[model samples]
Structures are given as structure tokens and as C-alpha cells.
Target: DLKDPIKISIPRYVLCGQGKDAHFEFEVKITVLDETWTVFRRYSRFREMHKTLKLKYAELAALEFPPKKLFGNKDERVIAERRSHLEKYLRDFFSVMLQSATSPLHINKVGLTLSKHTICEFSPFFKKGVFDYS
Candidate 1:
């Protein structure tokens, strides 16, 4: 028998907005079995997803999102560190979702409603159907 573990990485990031109001959007590349896909997501969107997951899944709330800092918010060093943590967070989140039989179904259905409200703020690569998961 052969098995492969899922792999995920955030190889790059882009800044959106201007000045103190700016936010980081990350380029997430995920590999599962023979398929690989990239998706772009922002911190705020991740927070929203976490909030919804926390409310519904309860267990997920224990997980941490990147911190909201009052100072050094845009420091290059800080951003780099945060980006690494975000990558880990997402990999874990998906692992839990995929393993739980009910979670994926719930996320694709009920969780999507919350996602529409929260995730609508950012544009992910999936929006264009550019990559074929099949």
C-alpha cells in the first residue's frame, strides 16, 4: 500500500489597499494526491471563515488566526512570519475538514452561506475556474 500526505505552501503574497489600511493577500498552493491548485486569500477572509467554523464546528474555534497587532502591522519581517503561520493554519483546517465526514458536506452547503458573506470581500483564483482540479 502507498500513501501520500497533502502538501500546502504560501510561496508569495501581494498587498492590497494603501497606507495603514493595506492588507496582505496570500497565494496558497495546495497539493493533494495527483492534483494541485492555487488559491488567493486574505487574512480578513480567513478570520471570517474561522469565525463561522467556530460557531458551527465549535472545535475549530480553538485554532488561532494571525494576530491583529496595533504596531508593526506592516513590517516586512512581521508579515513574513504571519504568512508562514497562515499557511500552516489553512493546511490544518483542510485536514480536519476532509477527515470529518460531515464537515466537508456542511462546509460545501451551509458553511458556504457564511462564506458568501465573509469570503465575498476577496477574489480567489477559483473565481475564474482557471485551474482544473480534475
Candidate 2:
């Protein structure tokens, strides 16, 4: 009963922080049901979110995320690769979660009813500073 498709992408990453707190924040664009919004997430935040998902959802038990790197983590090449990886991870996760949103399984799992489907209303990963469409 949905009218629009969902799309998620990571178009770019921003260089932020000082020497000791340096990090790359990737831009994640999420579009669903004709609404579009952007959110920035660092590598660690993505990893942490996945960890919780895996623990909460069985389908994400075997999901994989880019490993944490100690050397040259902020290099341009590293950022590029990690950006793509993070994008894929986000896509894969959405695919798995809503693979068959029409079915009762997912509707029961997330227990959400967004006009006809379930979604992330309480997700910190997609909030804090992000605005939603009215």
C-alpha cells in the first residue's frame, strides 16, 4: 500500500575536527514516500548502529560493516572507500528491514505504522540535527 520507493545514498564526506579529534563525516541522503532528507554520520556511529541492529534483528546477525582502521584512517583514499562501503551498508540494511513491508512480519517486528508502513521514528542515527518534512 506504499506509494513511493525508498532511496539511500552517501554522496560525500566532510573533513572535520582538529588533530586529536579529527574524523570524516559522511553525508547520507534518505528518501522515502516522496520525502527527502540528509544526515551526516561518522564511521564509528554507523558501526555502532549496526551492532545494535544485529543484536536486535536476526536478519542482521551476519551483516558486515567496514572494519575499524588504525592507520591512515583520514586519508582521502580511505574516506572514498569507506564512504562507498557505508553507503552500501545503509542500502543493505534498508533492503533487509523492509524487504517485504507488506507482510505482517516486519510490521510486527518494528511495530511501526507510518501511514501504512514501519520506520525509524526513534533513530538517533538519523536525528539530533536533521529536520523532517512537514
Candidate 3:
């Protein structure tokens, strides 16, 4: 296989900023056919989309999502736990998505409609040049 199977992964997270403004971003790396890039994101962003996806896709109803911010949200253990959870979620999510996307119309379940730009616009995080940041 040379490319075109879209894969998404959250391999790691990085802490950024100083003082009260400091936050961690999960490194969401996506790949396909000869292109790969990392998108920076945080837990809340994941939560927001999960809500929408869960509502939109009946197939996504049972996916597990990491819970946020109880025992000091910035702790190392918490971030590690969330990263692993989020990674697993993406792995399974993308797996199920690709299997159903035998046609472009099937892929439209994720985004709004099947158009030139909207085809790949499944999630805001998947958008390029568009902050990909939390």
C-alpha cells in the first residue's frame, strides 16, 4: 500500500506556556499516501467533537472518551492517561470510519456534505492552516 488510508494518532502531548496560562496539547499526527502532519490539540477540543460525532453518527454511540479535570488536570499521570485513551479512541474511530467509507457518500456522515473542500473536513482538527490548536 502506498498511501490513501487515512490514519490518525495521538502519540504524545506537550506542555506549553508558563504561569497560569500553561496548558498541554496532544500531538495528533495524521498520515496518508505520502503526506503526514501533526496537529496540536487539547482535551476539551476532543470533548467538543466527540459530542457532535456521538450525536451525528449512530455508529459512534459507544466509543469511550477520556474524562477531564478532576485530580489536578495538569498532572503528568492525568495527561498520560488521557493521551493513551485518546489514542485508542482515534485508532478505533478511524478504523470504523475507513471501513464504512467505501464511497464518498459514506464519508459524508462525518462532515457536512460531500463537496470539494468538505470531503476532508470531517473534523475541525482535520482542517489544515486552521489553528488545529485548542
Candidate 4:
């Protein structure tokens, strides 16, 4: 009985930082289980999720994710394009997660109250030392 009308969209984003270090923090709106909320997140968050998902699900390893800019994070044109890409990225990411029968438990349990800070941590795919480069 797991049927619900879900919609994912990001209608706005704010760019922060200076010079070459600028980053876009987006407000992601996820509507599922008849509930909705928006959370601000960075591009790094989605990148981390994609990396973890690839390791957790072999089938997802080859999936394409939003690309990083070769330059110009502060450029308005680049920020606009990245915003659209990230929206599509998250939409695709969640859609894939919800459709897989073998997906993680957290996928089915996502709620409107979920916070952006803890979103990536909800997945069992996240490992403590996976990102350690030292």
C-alpha cells in the first residue's frame, strides 16, 4: 500500500561566497505523503549522496550526475545552469530510489520534517571513513 503522489522541484537558489570559491545553495522542495517542505543545500551535499549511492547500489554506479564547473562558480550564467541541473539531479535521484524494490529503508520513510543537514546521513550507504583521503 505504498502509493503517494510525489513531486520534486527547485524554483529558486541563492549563490554565496566570493571569487572562484562561490557556491550555490539551493532550496529543494520535495512533496510526498501529502506533505512538503523546503531545505537549503549545497552542491557538495548532492555529490556526496551520489557517491554514497553508487557504492551502496552497484546499479547506480554508472548513472550520470550533475557536473562541476570547470570555472566560474560566481558567474551568474553558470549559477543559473547549475541550479537547473541540481534540481533535475535530485528529482532523478529520488525517483530512482523510490522505484527500486531493493532500495534502502529510508527511501520509503522520508518525511516533510527531514532536515537538509541530516539528509545524507539517513542512508545506510554513508560510511564514516569513505571520504577520508589522509
Worst 10 residues of 4 by lDDT: 125-134
Q: Given candidate 2, what's the lDDT at residue 103?
A: 30
Which regions of candidate 2 are displaced past 4 Å?
1-4, 100-118, 128-134
lDDT against the true structure, each candidate? 0.62, 0.70, 0.68, 0.63
Clashes of each: 0, 0, 2, 0
Estimated TM-score for each candidate: 0.64, 0.79, 0.74, 0.68
lDDT-based ranking, best first?
Answer: 2, 3, 4, 1
TM-score of 4: 0.68
What tens digits encode model 3's per-residue C-alpha lDDT throughout 1-134? 42235666787899977997898888888765345667778787778888987777766766777777566886799789889899888877766655565433353445624322342466765565554532
Flag clash pairs in model 3. Answer: 3-33, 4-33
Writing each residue's lDDT as its tens digit, candidate 2 over 28-115 gives 8887666667777888889889887677677876568778677988579988999998899888787777665543334344654442
Q: lDDT by residue for model 4 over 10-74, one digit each (tens)?
A: 78888767995777777667655555556666788778878977897865754689888677776
- Cα deviation in Å at residue 83, candidate 2? 0.3
TM-score, ranked from best to worst: 2, 3, 4, 1
Minimal lDDT window, size 10, model 2: 113-122
Task: Report the error of model 2 at residue 20, Å.
Answer: 2.3
